[PDB]
Amino acid sequence: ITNLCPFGEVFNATRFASVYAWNRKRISNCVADYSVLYNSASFSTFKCYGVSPTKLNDLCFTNVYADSFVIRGDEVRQIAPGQTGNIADYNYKLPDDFTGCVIAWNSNNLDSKVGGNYNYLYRLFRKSNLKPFERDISTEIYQAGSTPCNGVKGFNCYFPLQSYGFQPTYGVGYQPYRVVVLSFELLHAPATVCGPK
């Protein structure tokens, strides 16, 4: 077959985005081999929601969305259909009809940054619960009480984005894990990205 697309670019990427600013790379009109991601057994945690990993070779879809973000080690349970937590209601939410898979692995040596990584941010405060597959990039000041603050970091008026404290010598805990969410959506349109023939 011809025109083999680089589907493994999202797993071997050199730069990852934050959780509140998660990127979505559209992949279309190519052939993907799913045995590289599941049969190689090189990832730490991986689980498909609704589909079987051995049946993606004969059952194929029209479009795939590749979501990539870096979360903590205990926070991998929040990336699931129907969950609540610190990033499930604020940064990234999966719906109950989620038919994709979640592939994750431990990025200990590369994304370590001894001394405190001050690049990746995440949301603790928000005025409402986040919709599934919705991204929030704008950064205003949260107001949990009746107090107008115009650029004031005083009482009850703070920044709504913190830093991921990452330590290289720690029992696993909040370890940075690179999570790639491959959404598998099947529509009534003619299919574009299918498996090997």
Epitope: A144, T147, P148, G154
Partner: antibody, heavy 117, light 114 residues
Framework: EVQLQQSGPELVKPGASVKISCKTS????????MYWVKQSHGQSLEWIGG????????TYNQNFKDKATLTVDKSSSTAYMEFRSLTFDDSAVYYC??????????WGQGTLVTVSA | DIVMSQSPSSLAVSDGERVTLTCKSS????????????LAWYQQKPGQSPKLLIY???SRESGVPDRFTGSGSGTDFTLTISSVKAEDLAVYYC?????????FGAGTKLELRA
């Protein structure tokens, strides 16, 4: 509605300390914010300070610097206010103010603290 | 800090008359983003705890009777009661929510006649 159970009356001496509690019930204690209002001179209302229990932040008034401290208890859902270096002017009625919503702020019963020798 | 004044300090009212209470601030309490005036009106019964009646200077809280109407914006604020009753014998206060520290009013107590 919101149940704000305060302590009873205290009879203390100047120079000692006192503790004022305010137990909440019915709503989430870690969601809203806590405020304290001191009613002195019969009718005048004075603002002591506030302390959002979620991330434990605390602010105070200029009239109440280095006198009152605010701590919370997450396991019992009770707020604390402890006064140090009491004077004769501190003999007043202290109230527990809970900021549930901007439409109505819920008040307790009142803590009468009479300090004399 | 932000200070406020009440005018007057006491008013003699009879049953059936309308009463207006004036709360004037030293500066404007208008927030341009929310387009609301951060000011609250309280009422303290003798022997009871004070309760909030009018929030954001133009809205009536649920459970307050319809005689309590709030008005005003910016600096001049007015609490208007259409017809008082026997249960209206209390003291009223004025509190702003614009900035810290929170400032309470002087207190307006109603009387009888004559």
């Amino acid at each position: 509605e919101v149940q704000l159970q305060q302590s009873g009356p205290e009879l203390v001496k100047p120079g000692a300390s006192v503790k004022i509690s305010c137990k909440t019930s019915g709503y989430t204690f870690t969601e809203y914010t806590m405020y304290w209002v001191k009613q002195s001179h019969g009718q005048s209302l004075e603002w002591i300070g506030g302390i959002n229990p979620n991330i434990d932040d605390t602010t105070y008034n200029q009239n109440f610097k280095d006198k009152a401290t605010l701590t919370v208890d997450k396991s019992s859902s009770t707020a604390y206010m402890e006064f140090r270096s009491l004077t004769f002017d501190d003999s007043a009625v202290y109230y527990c103010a809970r900021d549930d919503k901007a439409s109505f702020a819920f008040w307790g019963q009142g803590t009468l603290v009479t300090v004399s020798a | 800090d932000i200070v406020m004044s009440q005018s007057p300090s006491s008013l003699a009212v009879s049953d059936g008359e309308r009463v207006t209470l004036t709360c004037k601030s030293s500066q404007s309490l208008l927030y341009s983003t929310n387009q609301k005036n951060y000011l609250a009106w309280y009422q303290q019964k003798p022997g009871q705890s004070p309760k909030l009646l009018i929030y954001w200077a133009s809205s009536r809280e649920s459970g307050v009777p319809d005689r309590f109407t709030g008005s005003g914006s910016g600096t001049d604020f007015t609490l208007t009661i259409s017809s008082v009753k026997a249960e209206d014998l209390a003291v009223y206060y004025c509190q702003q929510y614009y900035s810290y520290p929170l400032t309470f009013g002087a207190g307006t107590k109603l009387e009888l006649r004559a």
